Amino acid sequence: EFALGGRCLAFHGPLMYEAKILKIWDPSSKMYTSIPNKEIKPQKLGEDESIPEEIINGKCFFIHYQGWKSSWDEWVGYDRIRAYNEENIAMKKRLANLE
């Protein structure tokens, strides 16, 4: 359902937005896997990188919102991320259209 480089939906405020998964964090190992630019190996957080305290102890996803500047790329947990499927797309549309 949530793969490296895959599509997802993510809450940002009250609405949902299409996003792409760029990294996946394992809270047990304290390492993430990342899209390139094994073969893809887990790696520690960079010296200047941070994951919010609120979510660092769970599985986290570093996402890019489709069409937004890369400055909005951020870590989210399961509270905010959603599978890209028929039910969640319809919910995304309802939240924006109907409230």
Side-chain angles (χ1 to χ4, degrees):
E1 250 189 1
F2 301 121
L4 251 200
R7 187 177 332 89
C8 68
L9 294 167
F11 282 93
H12 186 282
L15 305 180
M16 306 170 62
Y17 298 89
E18 192 186 329
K20 182 181 163 178
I21 299 163
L22 304 187
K23 309 175 185 188
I24 298 175
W25 168 259
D26 183 339
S28 284
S29 74
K30 295 178 175 159
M31 294 183 98
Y32 61 72
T33 48
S34 179
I35 289 323
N37 69 90
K38 247 277 130 302
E39 203 154 346
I40 292 176
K41 305 171 171 187
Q43 63 181 283
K44 61 176 283 285
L45 271 178
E47 40 145 25
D48 299 333
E49 308 184 329
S50 182
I51 298 176
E53 209 150 62
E54 183 179 89
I55 57 167
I56 199 167
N57 298 308
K59 188 147 178 214
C60 293
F61 306 88
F62 188 71
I63 63 170
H64 171 253
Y65 294 93
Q66 205 70 193
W68 302 19
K69 301 176 199 195
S70 64
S71 70
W72 290 89
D73 292 4
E74 71 178 310
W75 296 98
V76 301
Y78 288 126
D79 184 54
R80 291 173 60 192
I81 198 172
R82 294 291 186 279
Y84 195 88
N85 64 28
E86 274 184 78
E87 181 183 296
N88 293 328
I89 288 184
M91 175 175 72
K92 164 187 177 280
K93 292 171 179 170
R94 214 174 290 120
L95 286 161
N97 285 328
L98 311 186
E99 262 189 349

